């Protein structure tokens, strides 16, 4: 997250860190959202490489024991059928990970609230992006969870030629674009939390930023719109 501030410990308890084994250790590659005790939602581009993955819930500092972490293996990866690695601008950047076991819920570990199907937010709705990704374009990962206030940019503005044009589809949510605050590499897969009816719900899965830079004026961060995928998500959980 560029232009973020540090989050409080139990502020975003559905946030997970998706990690892969790197030699002897484990490195953070992506965020995600805990949606069931044994299911995690993330971006499909996070699992394009065939690596050994684990999920960490109840995480706050990547490099220090917090006394709250649970570490569990990924047993099955279900990527959306239409995902195409060579065309992220086509959409379908979503994947569901079945965990090797059920995590224990507590004040640090809670399920993410999904929106009802078809829900579109109005322009400039209040949303927060969260993650441990790069804090500057070509910088380094955050050690502690960051958050940034990232209000939405509706589809008619986001797909206008001065913003992303044709590259954004209506199956995506755009948030930010002020040139200060954005998602950045390593925030991929994570939540965009938006306040709707007094409740924060996860409306986005972080998908891409400009190749020119993470915080670029009129290139808001782009998210998979979770409300476009509610039937697919429920059909995978109920059949697997």
Ligand X SMILES: CC(C)C[C@H](NC(=O)C(F)(F)F)C(=O)N[N@@+](C)(CC(=O)Nc1ccc(C(C)C)cc1)Cc1ccccc1
Give the active site residues.
45, 93, 188
Q: Is 50 annotated as a binding residue?
A: no
Q: Is 69 annotated as a binding residue?
A: yes
Residues 81-120: x/- map of binding to ligand X (CB under 6 A)? Answer: -------xx-------------------------------
Q: Which of 22, 66, 106, 160 binds Ca ion (CB under 5 A)?
A: 66
The Cα-based distances of 48 to 3, 78, 225 in angstroms read 28, 11, 20
Min dist CB 106 to ligand X, Å, is 28
Residues 52-81: x/- map of binding to ligand X (CB under 6 A)? Answer: ------------------------------
**CA atoms of 140 and 58, how far apart (whole Å):** 22
**Binding partner of 66, given ligand X, Ca ion, none, CB within 5-8 angstroms per partner class:** Ca ion
**Binding partner of 213, given Ca ion, ligand X, none, CB within 5-8 angstroms per partner class:** ligand X
Q: Is 61 annotated as a binding residue?
A: yes
Spatial CB neighbours of 190, under 8 Å, sequence gap ≥ 6:
15, 30, 31, 32, 33, 42, 129, 130, 131, 133, 183, 205, 206
**220: closest CA among 136, 151, 169, 161?**
151
Min dist CB 128 to ligand X, Å, is 15
Helix (H) or strand (E) holding 42, with range, is: strand 39-42
Min dist CB 168 to ligand X, Å, is 9
**CA atoms of 130 and 33, how far apart (whole Å):** 11
Min dist CB 48 to ligand X, Å, is 8
Closer residue to ligand X (CB): 65 or 138: 138
- What tokens were used for 236? 């995978």
Q: What residues between 200 and 239 interact with ligand X by CB under 6 A?
A: 206-211, 213-214
Half-sphere exposure of 102 (CA within 13 A, CB side): 5
Residues in contact with Ca ion, counted by CB under 5 A, come to a total of 2
**49 contacts ligand X (rule: CB under 6 A):** no
120 burial via Cβ count (<10 Å: 0-12, 13-18, 19+):
middle
Q: Which residues bind Ca ion (CB under 5 A)?
A: 61, 66
Which residues carry a binding-site annotation for Ca(2+)?
59, 61, 64, 69
């Amino acid at each position: 997250v560029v232009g973020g501030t540090e989050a409080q410990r139990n502020s975003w308890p559905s946030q997970i860190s998706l990690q892969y084994r790197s030699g002897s250790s484990w490195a953070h590659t992506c965020g995600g959202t805990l949606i069931r005790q044994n299911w995690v939602m993330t971006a499909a581009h996070c699992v394009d490489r065939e690596l050994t993955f684990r999920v960490v819930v109840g995480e706050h500092n990547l490099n220090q024991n917090n006394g709250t972490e649970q570490y569990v293996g990924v047993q099955k990866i279900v990527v959306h059928p239409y995902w195409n690695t060579d065309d992220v601008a086509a959409g379908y950047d979503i994947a569901l990970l079945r965990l090797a076991q059920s995590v224990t819920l507590n004040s640090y570990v809670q399920l993410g609230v999904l929106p009802r199907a078809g829900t579109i937010l109005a322009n400039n709705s209040p949303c927060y992006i969260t993650g441990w990704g790069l804090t500057r374009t070509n910088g380094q990962l955050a050690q502690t969870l960051q958050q940034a206030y990232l209000p939405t940019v509706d589809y008619a503005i986001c797909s206008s030629s001065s913003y992303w044009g044709s590259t954004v589809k209506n199956s995506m949510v755009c948030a930010g674009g002020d040139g200060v605050r954005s998602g950045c590499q390593g925030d991929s897969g994570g939540p965009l939390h938006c306040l709707v009816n007094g409740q924060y719900a996860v409306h986005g899965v972080t998908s891409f930023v400009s190749r020119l830079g993470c915080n670029v004026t009129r290139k808001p961060t782009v998210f998979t719109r979770v409300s476009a995928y509610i039937s697919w998500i429920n059909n995978v959980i109920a059949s697997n």
